[PDB]
């Protein structure tokens, strides 16, 4: 699989919920940022797609106040300016 090595806030956040690694693949990418925004509850409990990140540092990665997740092409683009191949 394709390895990618996170920036220092994506990395911080990834080693926040238990990652211990530098290098991930992007299925441990999205996995360890799944499980961030969970243990941080950010989704809505009402609307549980879209999560809310403007106070989170989350929201600085993503650059927007919230997204949903079913977003893929701005979930990627994110994950995208936050590593390097």
Do not use: W
Not at 8 to 26: C, E, H, I, R
Not at 70 to 84: G, Q
């Amino acid at each position: 699989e394709t390895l990618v090595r996170p920036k220092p806030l994506l990395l911080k956040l990834l080693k926040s919920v238990g990652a211990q690694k530098d290098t991930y693949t992007m299925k441990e990418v999205l996995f360890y940022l799944g499980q961030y925004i969970m243990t941080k509850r950010l989704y809505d409990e009402k609307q549980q797609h879209i999560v809310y990140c403007s106070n989170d540092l989350l929201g600085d990665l993503f650059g927007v106040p919230s997204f949903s997740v079913k977003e893929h092409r701005k979930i990627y683009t994110m994950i995208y300016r936050n590593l390097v191949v």
